[PDB]
Amino acid sequence: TCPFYKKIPGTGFTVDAFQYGVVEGCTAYFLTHFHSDHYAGLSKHFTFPVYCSEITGNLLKNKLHVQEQYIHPLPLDTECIVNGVKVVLLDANHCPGAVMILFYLPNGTVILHTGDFRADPSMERSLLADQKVHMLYLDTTYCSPEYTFPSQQEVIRFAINTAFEAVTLNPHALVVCGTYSIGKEKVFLAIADVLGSKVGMSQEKYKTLQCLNIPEINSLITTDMCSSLVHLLPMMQINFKGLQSHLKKCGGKYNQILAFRPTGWTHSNKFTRIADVIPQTKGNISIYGIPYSEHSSYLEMKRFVQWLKPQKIIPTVNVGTWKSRSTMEKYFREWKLEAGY
């Protein structure tokens, strides 16, 4: 049964609620982004109206085969009317196609659902600036002060510099990047751009990237692995056994692998700076864990909320334990007392 924190009161709407069968009273189903924990349940047999971004709509049609007549894509930053309720989709700074959703209830209440997001000061100048928000449904993934990580830009600087140095020392090294979902495309695209290579990948993954409206993509990716020196593999194969095996398959073209695992947070963050990150090495294989996040750090989250000043916060992540819930509620109170709302 659908939990309360996926329901929008005073509407017929749910958010990211496709795994519960027919939700009683739901007249439209919103989907914030194409990640499996959120889309779980959608297929070609779905016959209710789904409302989402253009990019999420492309993925629904091509990857899950949802029928076109049930896909309702909306433009960003534009006031739209859905079943008699004004809504606006905003960029969530998460994966491609990811949105937050502003709902303007018929009684005057205004709700923001963040979906999954990485808060940024740029959001303080969207259509959020223009009215008060009463209730916030918040991505609380890293809602604890131990979660610090660098900017995306510092992480890509590290990755480009490391790859360029390694391949310039050894023109026979191959770079491998792990993936298991959309998101974090800048990692492998930035490395390929510095090396003057296209990214090589499976046909399934190529199909997925072709749905993303990324400019000049035919220029950056390919299914011809033999022509590429940056290869994308499943995240599960990013280990010494999986990489040894892949290196065999390249037929003696390469004699070394440098690999990247973009994680979110890992406790090496508490102590070590990005500049100081070192790989795990075995023989001619090195594996770098890099803290590339698509969710808010604790500080980014706190800045957003203290700027928005919502009357009520509803967490959407870490809600399954009493200790987690109590911890987040204590931070929300601190923030409110410090800022004065």
Q: Is 116 in the site for Ni ion (CB under 5 A)?
A: yes
Q: Is 113 in the site for Ni ion (CB under 5 A)?
A: no
Give the binding-site size for Ni ion (rule: CB under 5 A): 2
Nearest distance from residue 94's CB to Ni ion, in Å?
6
Residues 5-34 that bind Ni ion (CB under 5 A): none
What count of other Cβ atoms lies within 10 Å of the Cβ of residue 87? 22
Q: Is 35 in the site for Ni ion (CB under 5 A)?
A: yes
Residue 38 vs 302, nearer CB to Ni ion: 38
Q: Taken in order 27, 94, 4, 311, is the CA torsion positive or negative?
A: negative
List, edge to edge, every strand of the sheet that includes 199-200. 221-222, 199-200, 230-234, 173-179, 256-263, 285-291, 280-282
Nearest distance from residue 15's CB to Ni ion, in Å?
13
Q: Is 118 in the site for Ni ion (CB under 5 A)?
A: no
Region binding Ni ion by CB under 5 A among candidate stretches 40-48, 81-89, 116-124, 150-158:
116-124
Region binding Ni ion by CB under 5 A among candidate stretches 1-9, 111-119, 254-262, 330-338:
111-119
Residue 35 vs 198, nearer CB to Ni ion: 35
**CA–CA distance, 59 with 61 (Å, rounded to integer):** 6
Region binding Ni ion by CB under 5 A among candidate stretches 41-49, 114-122, 157-165, 204-212:
114-122
Interstrand relation of 13-15 and 280-282 (parallel, antiparallel or unpaired): unpaired
Q: Is 139 in the site for Ni ion (CB under 5 A)?
A: no
Q: Which of 45, 48, 10, 9 is nearest to 31 (CA)?
A: 48
Chain centroid to CA 113: 15
Q: Which of 48, 41, 52 is nearest to 18 (CA)?
A: 41
Which DSSP symbol is given to 148? -
Residue 138 vs 285, nearer CB to Ni ion: 138
- Where along the sequence are the contacts to Ni ion (CB under 5 A)? 35, 116
